[PDB]
Amino acid sequence: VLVQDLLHPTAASEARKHKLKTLVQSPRSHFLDVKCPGCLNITTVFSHAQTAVTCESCSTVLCTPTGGKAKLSEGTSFRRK
Amino acid sequence: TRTSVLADALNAINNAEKTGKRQVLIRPSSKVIIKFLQVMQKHGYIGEFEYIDDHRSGKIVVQLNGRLNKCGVISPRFNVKIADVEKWTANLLPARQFGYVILTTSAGIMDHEEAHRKHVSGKILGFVY
Amino acid sequence: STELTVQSERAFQKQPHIFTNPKAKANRKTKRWYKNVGLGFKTPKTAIEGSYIDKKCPFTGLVSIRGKILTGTVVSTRMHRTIVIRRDYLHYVPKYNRYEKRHKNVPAHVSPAFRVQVGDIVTVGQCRPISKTVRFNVLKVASATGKANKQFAKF
Amino acid sequence: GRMHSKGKGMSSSAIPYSRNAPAWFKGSSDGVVEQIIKYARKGLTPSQIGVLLRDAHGVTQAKVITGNKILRILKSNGLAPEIPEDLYFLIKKAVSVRKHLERNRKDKDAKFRLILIESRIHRLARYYRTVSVLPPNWKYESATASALVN
Amino acid sequence: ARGPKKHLKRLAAPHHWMLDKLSGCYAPRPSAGPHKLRESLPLIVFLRNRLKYALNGREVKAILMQRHVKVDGKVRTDTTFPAGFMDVITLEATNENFRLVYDVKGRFAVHRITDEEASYKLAKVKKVQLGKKGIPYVVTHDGRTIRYPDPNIKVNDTVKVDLATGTITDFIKFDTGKLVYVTGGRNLGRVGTIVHRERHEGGFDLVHIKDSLENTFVTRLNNVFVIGEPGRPWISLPKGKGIKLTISEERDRRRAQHGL
Amino acid sequence: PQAKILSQAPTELELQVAQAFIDLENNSPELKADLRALQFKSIREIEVAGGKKALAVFVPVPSLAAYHKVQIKLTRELEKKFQDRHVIFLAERRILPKPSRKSRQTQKRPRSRTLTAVHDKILEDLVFPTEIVGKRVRYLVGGNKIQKILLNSKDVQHIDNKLESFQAVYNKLTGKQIVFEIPS
RNA sequence: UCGGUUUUUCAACCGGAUCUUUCCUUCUGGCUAACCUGUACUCCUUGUGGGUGCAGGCGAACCAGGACUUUUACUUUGAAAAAAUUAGAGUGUUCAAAGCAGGCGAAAGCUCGAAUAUAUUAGCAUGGAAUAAUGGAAUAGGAC
Ligand SMILES: [Mg+2]
Ligand SMILES: [Zn+2]
């Protein structure tokens, strides 16, 4: 289509394409720090956690991995960092 | 599997030319392809090539003039001797004198005329025009 | 290659025309003769240190080396003092501008000095027709790939 | 293209750029290494270890944080599996298939799948043999596979 | 099959004789001789065609058997006598002396010389052996042997022979930077100084040779024949100084010399 | 200071750097005890074409981690004290020669001892903890290699007015033409 | 200038030499030839014009001797590929195919000849080291 800049892609166009198909092959996955209702400190959980996860000392389920992402149990607060 | 990366790149370029599109995306790229592109630029067949040669393998984007007609390959890279170069030119290049047969020689990757000047033939890598 | 059990045969093996004096003993008792073959192919110390026999030997025998020196891969040692070396190829057919692949099973002689195993790069030189097929004999044996003796089992 | 069955499938795990930092995902490399070692001791495959790391600890890749990959690290500390993970898994699968066949014989699809698996194993095996990993001559039939099991 | 070849066909003949391919079906096979059949030049090929002193075989025979003809020393009664390189032909009539030396392009040119230089032959050393009783002898390139030489004579060296006696007066040691003659192959009859040796292991040993016109050419030691110091030759060279001129140069010469 | 800092022997620049280091130590708690493992190899006060200068320091490769652990504040202090000359920390990486067709090949030659990768590493280092996310390369019509270096917008205030200087430094080091960029 | 000839101003096109942050197998010396050199100073235009010259010190300009060298596949150059034939010079076999002669004086006697090019691939030695494999130091028995 005459000219399209395949080096400066727009923020929406890149989003439209998946993961690897973009000019820079980077994960869409942002893995999170969690604040569970029991513990008092942050712990790292992956967005697509694969297996069962425990918080710190007590065996408390944080995320149930079904399909793509992880089903975060009950309702916890989280950031991208 | 993709066997010859350079070949694929050239095909892509050709397709772009056919379309009238003035940009490409060479997928695996690197080294040989880059040198080929440089050679082309030397005579001004492609406008300007820029690669996101990242931390993986490399991806070339070619902002091209569109003046290029066709750019071949031949992946059975035949060992060209100093005499049958003429024959090759006759076969591959359209005009008697316009166009460049790309040779990977011991002296480096360059066009046919340049190779002749250095008096070193090598192996055929491709051609433009 | 052979190794060990030297004289043990029907006829007792002698290095011909050369002699060791049985009247007085000197330092290392037996004198075994050896030649520096030439062409820059280094003599094995094991040929002098270890005392075998072999008339066909490039080093300790009356066998000389002049002609063409070829290199190939060791394929067959299921023999005795003989080695089958596959030479590689690129026979160019003019018609198609392309190369064939071919096999030449050059059979050669392996001096008891040299330790050779199946699947190794081997240098061979021309000789007097020493057998029906054997007209070559070992000059130097390198490593298998790069590792000397590191090939072992898992943890 | 996905070897045996027809179907392309572009399901692939991405790896990001800058093979050094992810800084706010803290913890020294030594600690990570120790954790890995512990996991190995408890009896887990490198892949499994990686998965565990993904689950719990502030890691991205061991090749990023430490200088080495997980298998390499294991090799260095002499805590590697007998038959390199994937191969082991394949052999297990083969064994299972054989058992199934023994139980019920006429299942021809199963037989076909077994054959495919065997072929795959052979393919793997040859390459392993080449890269000086496994000792020369390695049989993958019911006389040895059964013995291997785990 | 069966035995040695006696005849020779006028096509199977060596090239640098330039014999008339049509007139005649047999060439002269030179007899058993000093030089190699390929290198050597027989008298009938020379006398009949190069000098034009005869026109027939009978004529040649007449010339020879009357014993006016002398090669290096003796007369040689036979027709088919092999005369190769550096050999002196003294004819008793008018004292027309020749040395058989090659030309620029490879031919045995009729080089006319006086009795002063036509008194000694130059001879390449083939081998040095210690013979019976413990006697060193030197082997000339013309098969000839001289017993008791200079002890510092090695192979590829060149030696003076006074012809009247089988004796060495002087020799030119083989040295890089000594003017030389080439005797065979694609490059024949050219002259240069020898730049560098290539020693090599097991057969075939090359030397790089440079002429006055700055044109390098590499040749085997087999065809290399030393003439002397750079600047001074020991043998008078054919016209054009025996330097292999380019085709263009030849054309120019042709186009410059239209004189009548 | 001749054995503590220099690791070699000569040069007035080296002496100056040592003096600066000593001055930095005189602060006492956080800026003395935290930094006594550091060694200062070759320094080149290399200039930007028309303007300010840049102090290009080379330091040991077995460390670097230590420098990263400290750095930043130290660099700032150096900038403050030695007047308007841009401090840069680099590693003395060897670059082993290309295995020729002739010449005796001593060892495999480590992939850590190449050219291009080494240069990339240097580039990564030279930009003080800000990090690259793209090494895109423009190749001009004439035949000139010019590299864009993609920087993330998160913390660019540390460099900001040092980009040109950085580029100049890189050019002086190699000859490769370098540019830095931040996306929207 | 008496149609050819080379400096300069400039372009282009390689080639080789270079230190470059980055090396040519390596020395055991033979031998050095030239200066980083300088020891005395000067022939002489006020002196880096000019170098004979031996006591610290240039490796390559090849000699001969080891020690080991990842190997090849390519390609270049060279050597080879007997002649006849083919391609192709020169030459009025009356022309032509031919052949290899002839042509030129004063027609009383002296010189140009009879070239070269390919004929590929298999081996032979070199220039090149991009392309394509191949192999280096992971249980280091690794390197200097
Ligand atoms: Mg013809
Ligand atoms: Zn809780």
TrEMBL record, chain C:
An example molecular function term from Gene Ontology annotations: rRNA binding
InterPro entries: NA-bd_OB-fold, Ribosomal_uS17, Ribosomal_uS17_arc/euk, Ribosomal_uS17_CS, Ribosomal_uS17_N
Domain Small ribosomal subunit protein uS17 N-terminal per the UniProt entry, residue ranges: 7-70
GO CC list: cytosolic small ribosomal subunit
Domain of life where this protein originates: Eukaryota
Family the entry assigns: Belongs to the universal ribosomal protein uS17 family.
Protein name in the entry: RP41
Native species: Kluyveromyces lactis (strain ATCC 8585 / CBS 2359 / DSM 70799 / NBRC 1267 / NRRL Y-1140 / WM37)
From TrEMBL, chain D:
Protein's UniProt keywords contain Ribonucleoprotein: yes
One annotated Gene Ontology cellular component of this protein: cytosolic small ribosomal subunit
SMART domains (alphabetical): Ribosomal_S13_N, Ribosomal_S15
BP GO terms, sorted: translation
InterPro entries linked: Ribosomal_uS15 (IPR000589), Ribosomal_uS15_arc_euk (IPR023029), Ribosomal_uS15_N (IPR012606), uS15_NS1_RNA-bd_sf (IPR009068)
Keyword entries, A-Z: Ribonucleoprotein, Ribosomal protein
Domain of life of the native organism: Eukaryota
Keyword Lyase: no
Domain Small ribosomal subunit protein uS15 N-terminal: 1-59
GO molecular function: small ribosomal subunit rRNA binding; structural constituent of ribosome
NCBIfam families xrefs: PRK08561.1 (NF006331)
Family: Belongs to the universal ribosomal protein uS15 family.
Protein name (database record): KLLA0F18040p
TrEMBL record, chain E:
GO cellular component, one term: cytosolic small ribosomal subunit
Domain RNA-binding S4: 41-105
Keyword vocabulary terms for this entry: Ribonucleoprotein, Ribosomal protein, RNA-binding, rRNA-binding
Pfam family, one: RS4NT
BP GO annotations: cytoplasmic translation
InterPro entries: KOW (IPR005824), Rib_uL2_dom2 (IPR014722), Ribosomal_eS4 (IPR000876), Ribosomal_eS4_C (IPR032277), Ribosomal_eS4_central_region (IPR013845), Ribosomal_eS4_central_sf (IPR038237), Ribosomal_eS4_KOW (IPR041982), Ribosomal_eS4_N (IPR013843)
Keyword RNA-binding applies: yes
PROSITE patterns for this protein: RIBOSOMAL_S4E (PS00528), S4 (PS50889)
One Gene Ontology MF term: structural constituent of ribosome
Family per record: Belongs to the eukaryotic ribosomal protein eS4 family.
Entries under PANTHER family matching the protein: 30S/40S RIBOSOMAL PROTEIN S4 (PTHR11581), SMALL RIBOSOMAL SUBUNIT PROTEIN ES4 (PTHR11581:SF0)
Subunit relationships: Component of the small ribosomal subunit (SSU). Mature yeast ribosomes consist of a small (40S) and a large (60S) subunit. The 40S small subunit contains 1 molecule of ribosomal RNA (18S rRNA) and 33 different proteins (encoded by 57 genes). The large 60S subunit contains 3 rRNA molecules (25S, 5.8S and 5S rRNA) and 46 different proteins (encoded by 81 genes).
Protein name in UniProt: 40S ribosomal protein S4
Source species: Kluyveromyces lactis (strain ATCC 8585 / CBS 2359 / DSM 70799 / NBRC 1267 / NRRL Y-1140 / WM37)
TrEMBL record, chain F:
Alphabetic keyword roster: Ribonucleoprotein, Ribosomal protein
PROSITE patterns with a match to the protein in the record: RIBOSOMAL_S7E
GO molecular function, one term: structural constituent of ribosome
Any one Gene Ontology BP term: rRNA processing
Domain of life the protein comes from: Eukaryota
Similarity remark: Belongs to the eukaryotic ribosomal protein eS7 family.
Entry protein name: 40S ribosomal protein S7
Source taxonomy: Eukaryota, Fungi, Dikarya, Ascomycota, Saccharomycotina
